[PDB]
Amino acid sequence: QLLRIDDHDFSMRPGFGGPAIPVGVDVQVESLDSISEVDMDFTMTLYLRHYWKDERLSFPSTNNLSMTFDGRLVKKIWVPDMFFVHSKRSFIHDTTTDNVMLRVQPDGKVLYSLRVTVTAMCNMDFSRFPLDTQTCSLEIESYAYTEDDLMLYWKKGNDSLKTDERISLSQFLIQEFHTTTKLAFYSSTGWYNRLYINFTLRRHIFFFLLQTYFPATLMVMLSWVSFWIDRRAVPARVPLGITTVLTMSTIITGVNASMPRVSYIKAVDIYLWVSFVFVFLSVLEYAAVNYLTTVQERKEQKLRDTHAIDKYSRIIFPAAYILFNLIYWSIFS
Amino acid sequence: QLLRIDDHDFSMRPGFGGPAIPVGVDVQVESLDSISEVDMDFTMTLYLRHYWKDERLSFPSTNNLSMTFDGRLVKKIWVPDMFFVHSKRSFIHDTTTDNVMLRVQPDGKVLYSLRVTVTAMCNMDFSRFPLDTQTCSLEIESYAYTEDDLMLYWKKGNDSLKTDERISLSQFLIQEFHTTTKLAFYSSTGWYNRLYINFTLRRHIFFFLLQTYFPATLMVMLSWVSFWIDRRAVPARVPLGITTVLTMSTIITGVNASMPRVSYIKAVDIYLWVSFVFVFLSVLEYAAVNYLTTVQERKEQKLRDTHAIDKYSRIIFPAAYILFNLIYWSIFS
Amino acid sequence: QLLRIDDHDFSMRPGFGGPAIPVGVDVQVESLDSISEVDMDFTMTLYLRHYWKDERLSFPSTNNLSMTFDGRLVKKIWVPDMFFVHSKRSFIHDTTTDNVMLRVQPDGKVLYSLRVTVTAMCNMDFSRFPLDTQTCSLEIESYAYTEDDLMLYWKKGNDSLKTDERISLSQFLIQEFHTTTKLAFYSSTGWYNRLYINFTLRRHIFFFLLQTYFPATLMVMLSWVSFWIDRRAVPARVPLGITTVLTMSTIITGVNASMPRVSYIKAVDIYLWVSFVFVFLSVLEYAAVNYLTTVQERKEQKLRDTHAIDKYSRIIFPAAYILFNLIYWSIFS
Amino acid sequence: QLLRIDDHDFSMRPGFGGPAIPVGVDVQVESLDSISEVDMDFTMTLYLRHYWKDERLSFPSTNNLSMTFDGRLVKKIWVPDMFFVHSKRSFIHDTTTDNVMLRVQPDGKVLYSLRVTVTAMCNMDFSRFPLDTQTCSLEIESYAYTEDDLMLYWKKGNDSLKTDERISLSQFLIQEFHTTTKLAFYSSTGWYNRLYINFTLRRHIFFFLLQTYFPATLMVMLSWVSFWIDRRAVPARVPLGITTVLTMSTIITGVNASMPRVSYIKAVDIYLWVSFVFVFLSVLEYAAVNYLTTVQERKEQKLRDTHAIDKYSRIIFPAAYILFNLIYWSIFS
Amino acid sequence: QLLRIDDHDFSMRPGFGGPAIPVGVDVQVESLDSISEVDMDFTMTLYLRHYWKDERLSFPSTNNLSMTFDGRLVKKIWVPDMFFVHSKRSFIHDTTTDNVMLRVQPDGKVLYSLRVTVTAMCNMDFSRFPLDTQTCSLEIESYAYTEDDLMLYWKKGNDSLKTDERISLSQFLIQEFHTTTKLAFYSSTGWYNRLYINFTLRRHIFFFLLQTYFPATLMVMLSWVSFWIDRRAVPARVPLGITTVLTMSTIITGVNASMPRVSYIKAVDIYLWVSFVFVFLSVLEYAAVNYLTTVQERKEQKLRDTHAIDKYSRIIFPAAYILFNLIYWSIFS
Ligand SMILES: C[C@]12CC[C@@H](O)C[C@@H]1CC[C@@H]1[C@@H]2CC[C@]2(C)[C@@H](C(=O)CO)CC[C@@H]12
Ligand SMILES: C[C@]12CC[C@@H](O)C[C@@H]1CC[C@@H]1[C@@H]2CC[C@]2(C)[C@@H](C(=O)CO)CC[C@@H]12
Ligand SMILES: C[C@]12CC[C@@H](O)C[C@@H]1CC[C@@H]1[C@@H]2CC[C@]2(C)[C@@H](C(=O)CO)CC[C@@H]12
Ligand SMILES: C[C@]12CC[C@@H](O)C[C@@H]1CC[C@@H]1[C@@H]2CC[C@]2(C)[C@@H](C(=O)CO)CC[C@@H]12
Ligand SMILES: C[C@]12CC[C@@H](O)C[C@@H]1CC[C@@H]1[C@@H]2CC[C@]2(C)[C@@H](C(=O)CO)CC[C@@H]12
Ligand SMILES: *[C@@H]1O[C@H](CO)[C@@H](O)[C@H](O)[C@H]1NC(C)=O
Ligand SMILES: *[C@@H]1O[C@H](CO)[C@@H](O)[C@H](O)[C@H]1NC(C)=O
Ligand SMILES: *[C@@H]1O[C@H](CO)[C@@H](O)[C@H](O)[C@H]1NC(C)=O
Ligand SMILES: *[C@@H]1O[C@H](CO)[C@@H](O)[C@H](O)[C@H]1NC(C)=O
Ligand SMILES: *[C@@H]1O[C@H](CO)[C@@H](O)[C@H](O)[C@H]1NC(C)=O
Ligand SMILES: CCCCCCCCCCCC
Numbered sequence A, B, C, D, E: 001q002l003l004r005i006d007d008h009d010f011s012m013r014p015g016f017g018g019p020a021i022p023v024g025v026d027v028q029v030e031s032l033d034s035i036s037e038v039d040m041d042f043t044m045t046l047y048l049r050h051y052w053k054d055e056r057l058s059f060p061s062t063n064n065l066s067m068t069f070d071g072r073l074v075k076k077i078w079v080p081d082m083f084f085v086h087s088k089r090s091f092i093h094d095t096t097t098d099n100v101m102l103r104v105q106p107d108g109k110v111l112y113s114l115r116v117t118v119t120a121m122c123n124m125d126f127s128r129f130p131l132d133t134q135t136c137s138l139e140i141e142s143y144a145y146t147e148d149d150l151m152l153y154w155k156k157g158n159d160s161l162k163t164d165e166r167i168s169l170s171q172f173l174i175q176e177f178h179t180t181t182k183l184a185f186y187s188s189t190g191w192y193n194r195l196y197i198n199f200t201l202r203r204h205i206f207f208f209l210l211q212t213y214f215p216a217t218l219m220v221m222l223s224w225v226s227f228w229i230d231r232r233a234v235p236a237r238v239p240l241g242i243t244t245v246l247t248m249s250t251i252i253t254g255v256n257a258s259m260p261r262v263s264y265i266k267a268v269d270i271y272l273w274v275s276f277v278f279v280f281l282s283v284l285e286y287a288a289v290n291y292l293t294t295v296q297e298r299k300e301q302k303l304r305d306t307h308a309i310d311k312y313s314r315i316i317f318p319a320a321y322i323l324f325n326l327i328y329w330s331i332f333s
């Protein structure tokens, strides 16, 4: 055998009982899979690499080059114990075998690589939905060793993160990958070193525009055509307003089907409910006109053209709606 | 080897055949994941720690400090056998390796830590839904050893429970974590000691308000505008009431889609069905008015203005609805 | 070692080549989890215990008391081979270790306990749904040994079944747990002994009442108010009947969404379709009245008050509906 | 030990390097679970048995009877390697242990039994849906050995298939179980022997009748009552036809929700679209009548009873619908 | 033993420390399972075969023919380490045993075969949906060895890919299977050789035609019948247009339920929204006619037949719709 595995006890780390051992980390991201608003999490696939030195794995040679071993030798040597903090589930791919790489140099330097898929939590804010922007991160830490036993750092600084050129999401734009570091404390175990991978997402607005904003505006404009119809056709003007109200209610109900039940109002809700109020007032206007006409007829009868309300509504309603749209799209850009 | 594993039989507990062995327990909660009303359960992730002494694991040293071992040595020594009572499913995280920690002091004291995810049952009461409050707990017990063999207790009393500062639920407010203890009996195996983790949840009401209570009130108010319309427009006043009835029915049907089929009435059902009855009576009022008008016309014909019912309805209906709202929101706060 | 495991061949049962060995069985039920109408199955969690004697496990002592062993010794001795007949899936809980107990007395008596979750088939009859009652059972049998090798029986007769005081289902009432026994034959392997666990379920009716029966009756009563409206308002009386028909159809469609596609009619279907027929006839009545009125007008014209049909309908329709309800609720209680 | 396992190398089949070894197969079917039209597959549970002879498993005795072994001895001997062709997923039940049986006679004959659940593909034709009939099969073959190494056959001919007396499907009738055999070729590995299990399914028609065919016929008949209403009530005759059209469209949309998107028309689609066309023509008839009446009035005005179209429609529409029904139900039986 | 396994160290590849070892690859495709538009992936099942030479597996014989071994010998020898690039999940079938084949010739040539199921990503473009065409591929590469250690190539060139004669998809047409090769680079590990399997899919259009395009055209044509109705029936002409608008909106909402939220418009959306605009303009036309008629009546009153707009609309609307259809079906074929 080229490696003297049987001569050592690999239940103890290199430098056991002494100074801490440094371990470097390098990463390449392969894909971003899915994003859930109800669960508030994301899924990622990536390659994870480790670097350290262990003098028990030294072997003699003349070329001084790395050699590759098959990968079932991993379970017989010491290996770091990284885990993903705040994750829900994860696994290691194993077809047609375990996706594991092991390379050793003659002096004892080791490279160790894995392929994993992780689901991790992300806390999202929906006050500007669907014109919102989110920030998420992934955290890496050792489970068992404190900073007095294992020192964890990025292998090459800022150059330690790479991404695939094919990374894409159908509903979001991805930008600004970078890495950071921070210490963490547990009240009963000690201090640990954490690594972070940060990125930002921006949602696409076109679908929501065409699917939600256009129909509501069309219904609001459809409510205005009743002001131009003769007031003597009562069963021609009542159903138009009633149907507009019902369709607006259906749109409002259908919009919320995909979202969690948060305790605050979103940007699209304001628009939809203002439109609903506009249509409701349009319905009340004709009732006022009809009542006043009947009262006037009775008063003229007891003594033995267009009403002003319609004429004013024809100008007042569109101007108010246009002003609301100006303010709304200035605030939410 | 530093530890003399091969010299002992670890199929027997420490102090086998004698007094019971004490085991202490410490916990840190990482997250609360999901809550299901149809299944009546919750999911939790946490770190679980054990403390005991075993003289077979003693080794010589001079510094008198804990040493950390890699974690594959767990399957060769004796270890406690805790399990979660009344749970549906659970697992131990295992990427990139088993999330396990093992630390031993020179005298033989042991610390053993794990990372687990559990789904557990909780019995919920929905009589005040959606203005309700729930209480749930998680139970820990040994499977095989009775109190004559193993003594289970909280390691530091009330200071044995910690929580993450990021614990959050989108639909609930979390409060009042605390711990208790109680004995349990099985008729064919004996007495056991149980540990409890208790907490309380309060639901957020804003979403339900805006989604359910506002539309029903708007429909009820929309039914009242017919009292102000001339009674000679029969096909203008019938469709308004009919459409209000149908929309109320649709809202009632849509509300129940997310809930289990309990054998009692909930708080929101009372409100919705009272609103439905209000709209139904609004429909019946116009039929009465029309019948009386036709009868009066026939009687006046055989001899050769606003009806009182509308005038009274205009005041009676809103006052009754306001009184109902006052009583309802005083009872359910 | 206290037990002489290495001195025996545990691939053979106790009393190999001779008379059969008796094995007793004891059970405690922990929970009933879910019931599926489309799949026709249920899920159960329980503790399962075995009793037998094996002289190869004898050890010397003075106190004559049971001793508990850690549980990894199970895979080195002989153990029975029970399985669940007619089951779809099952597993054994394994956090934080296998939920297994092993106790041995000095003479060689053994107690062996496990914690399992099972999904099993149950054949349900829905002719009286949703006022129905179902009966289900769970079956236990050895896989490999016939009655000439292994004798299976209940350990203490009728006292061998216990249940948790917290067992509950949100939609059903649980009653009448009991146990039975019966022999089974396979044409190519032989005779086997089976154990049964029987129980009964009764569904709660309140939700179905409030959700389905009340709206249909309200629609049927809403169809009757047209008989009191003047016959000269044709576009006021046609839409009322049409909308009642459409709403009844929607209710009928929504009711069936949760049920399997059986080849017979259920109790609720009869009620819903009779209501639909009532509303359809209500629609036809006004067409008859209108046609007769127009014919009479033409006949009176060519020579140069309330129609009887409405007056009779006002009494005939409610009486028939009340009679149908009396008969229906006498038959289905 | 009764069996001399350690004295042989069980990585080689019986008769290695010589003539092929015969293996017989016997089957009992326990249940048919589910049928998916969108995925076009079915699920089955069954017991699978194997028969062969291996002289390395001979042991001495006097009674000459089969002996049963616990079942963990399977992983130490040679065993056949059957797999299910064209399957999507499958598993072996393992509670409370692996559902495995092993019986050996003193001369070396072996019986080996398993309990499995399989999901397999079936290609379905929906041109006569929902009055259709389907045929499906399950295929069994060895993975690694060609016919020159292993000979696969039915153990007892036609008597090798048994079924449970409780096998049932809620939506189908099951009939005609039988078995066949055929050879298969792979261009790079060789020739193999396949076994088949065939059966037929017939769908139940009652639910589809009551749910789909009756409402469409009722809507078509409801369209005809307008021919008997006076032509001077325009806003009483337009809404009736419009509502019938809309309800027919809703029924058509609701019918297709459960089916895959095939590239041909089904039997129910023809009926629904013919009904839709009938209602559309009913709407056009009144427009023609109204236009002709207005033209006649203008012509009579410029010179200073029932229209024939209604009278003919009253007879022509029902006769055509009855003729269509006769032809349709003669073709599709 | 025929093979001298115990005399060698199989943690090192053949030709360790020297020139690279060639490995050939051959494939037969069994099925294509499912295609997801929201997830943008596909599932495939196939047989995978490897070819190489290892002199450590030589054995003496006279016939010079391949011999088959049981398959548990795989875990004791060296074997290649292929994996699927850009895949989400995969597994190896294992009933009734691992689907693995191992054949060795006396000189040391090896054949090794497996049966696997893979889910892999495919980037789809929906600008021409549902008249679109997609191209997908599957990628095979070694995980641990670079081109200086292992040379990967197609075993027989273009003749290395076979497909089953039963491969079918219900919604797509499959064509043009072929293979390619390309080198790949990782910035921290080196150069690797990749193999590709390419194919093309074309969707079936019949279902979408009958389900979506026909109803929208029918609604558009139904909007035109109002131009032929007398303008004095206001509550007969308003509801027709309103109902057409609402039904068009429902169709548009129902179409999008199955698709991802892309940031561009699809082919079917253009058609549906143009139809919606047509119906909206149809509604506005009658409002214009009514307003002009009322104004003319007032003007004629103050001094003390068919309107031109309807007559022109009857020709202008159908011609514009026909022209739009011509252009649309010329562009999208
Ligand atoms: C056309 C529509 C949506 C569809 C109807 O509701 C009408 C509004 C009018 C205002 C528009 C808006 C789409 C989004 C716009 C173009 C805004 C943006 O630049 C977005 O970043 C500024 C003004 C906005
Ligand atoms: C506005 C709305 C809901 C929307 C319509 O139904 C009208 C009611 C009127 C009474 C309101 C209620 C919302 C909840 C309120 C504010 C109660 C609370 O403090 C809740 O803790 C007291 C009075 C309640
Ligand atoms: C109120 C309602 C349901 C809601 C409307 O359909 C009207 C019926 C009238 C008859 C009622 C029935 C509910 C169930 C009752 C009370 C029966 C039972 O004791 C049930 O065990 C006997 C009479 C039944
Ligand atoms: C009653 C209904 C369905 C409900 C309405 O559409 C009217 C048709 C009329 C023709 C009937 C059909 C049901 C199926 C029948 C009875 C056919 C069969 O024996 C079926 O095998 C022959 C004639 C068919
Ligand atoms: C009948 C229908 C769909 C249903 C209504 O919208 C009317 C159009 C009219 C134009 C037709 C189209 C179906 C697809 C056709 C036949 C095109 C194709 O050869 C497709 O490759 C050319 C013209 C197209
Ligand atoms: C990347 O690292 C460099 C060097 O430490 C630092 O100056 C820079 O701010 C980092 N970039 C980001 C985006 O954090
Ligand atoms: C916590 O423990 C202390 C000490 O036993 C006890 O007094 C106190 O009531 C406990 N708190 C709760 C909330 O149970
Ligand atoms: C319980 O067992 C006893 C004794 O065998 C028997 O008499 C009784 O009928 C059983 N009870 C039931 C409910 O089967
Ligand atoms: C069953 O097998 C017999 C004997 O080979 C054969 O004659 C018969 O046709 C088979 N039955 C069927 C239904 O295939
Ligand atoms: C198949 O391989 C041959 C030989 O290399 C090549 O000429 C041909 O273009 C290939 N076919 C395809 C479709 O790539
Ligand atoms: C009826 C729609 C009115 C739209 C008014 C235009 C809004 C433009 C806002 C631009 C702010 C940047």
Ligand SMILES: CCCCCCCCCCCC
Residues within 6 Å of the ligand: B217, B321, B322, B325, B326, B329, B330
């Ligand atoms: C039409 C809505 C009437 C709402 C009446 C106000 C209810 C306030 C109740 C306050 C009780 C604390």
Ligand SMILES: CCCCCCCCCCCC
Residues within 6 Å of the ligand: C217, C321, C322, C325, C326, C329, C330
């Ligand atoms: C309109 C509802 C009529 C309900 C008639 C009462 C039915 C009571 C049946 C009691 C039988 C036990």
Ligand SMILES: CCCCCCCCCCCC
Residues within 6 Å of the ligand: D217, D321, D322, D325, D326, D329, D330
């Ligand atoms: C309006 C429904 C007409 C139904 C006509 C009867 C069809 C019977 C067909 C019998 C063919 C075997």
Ligand SMILES: CCCCCCCCCCCC
Residues within 6 Å of the ligand: E217, E321, E322, E325, E326, E329, E330
């Ligand atoms: C109302 C439907 C009009 C359809 C006009 C025919 C379109 C044919 C386009 C052929 C282009 C190849």
Ligand SMILES: CCCCCCCC
Residues within 6 Å of the ligand: A284, A287, A288, A291, B221, B224, B225, B228
């Ligand atoms: C809901 C009340 C409407 C009142 C309308 C009366 C206009 C003066």
Ligand SMILES: CCCCCCCC
Residues within 6 Å of the ligand: B284, B287, B288, B291, C221, C224, C225, C228
């Ligand atoms: C459903 C019956 C309505 C009766 C209305 C008659 C008013 C006197």
Ligand SMILES: CCCCCCCC
Residues within 6 Å of the ligand: A221, A224, A225, A228, E287, E288, E291
């Ligand atoms: C001259 C026709 C007036 C119609 C205006 C409609 C505005 C929505």
Ligand SMILES: CCCCCC
Residues within 6 Å of the ligand: A308, A309, A312, A313, A316
């Ligand atoms: C809609 C407001 C009209 C005001 C008339 C004085």
Ligand SMILES: CCCCCC
Residues within 6 Å of the ligand: B308, B309, B312, B313, B316
């Ligand atoms: C709605 C009640 C009116 C009472 C008239 C006497």
Ligand SMILES: CCCCCC
Residues within 6 Å of the ligand: C308, C309, C312, C313, C316
């Ligand atoms: C509804 C039946 C009326 C009978 C009139 C003679």
Ligand SMILES: CCCCCC
Residues within 6 Å of the ligand: D308, D309, D312, D313, D316
């Ligand atoms: C519906 C066709 C009527 C024919 C009148 C000549």
Ligand SMILES: CCCCCC
Residues within 6 Å of the ligand: E308, E309, E312, E313, E316
């Ligand atoms: C619809 C356009 C009509 C033009 C009349 C001048």
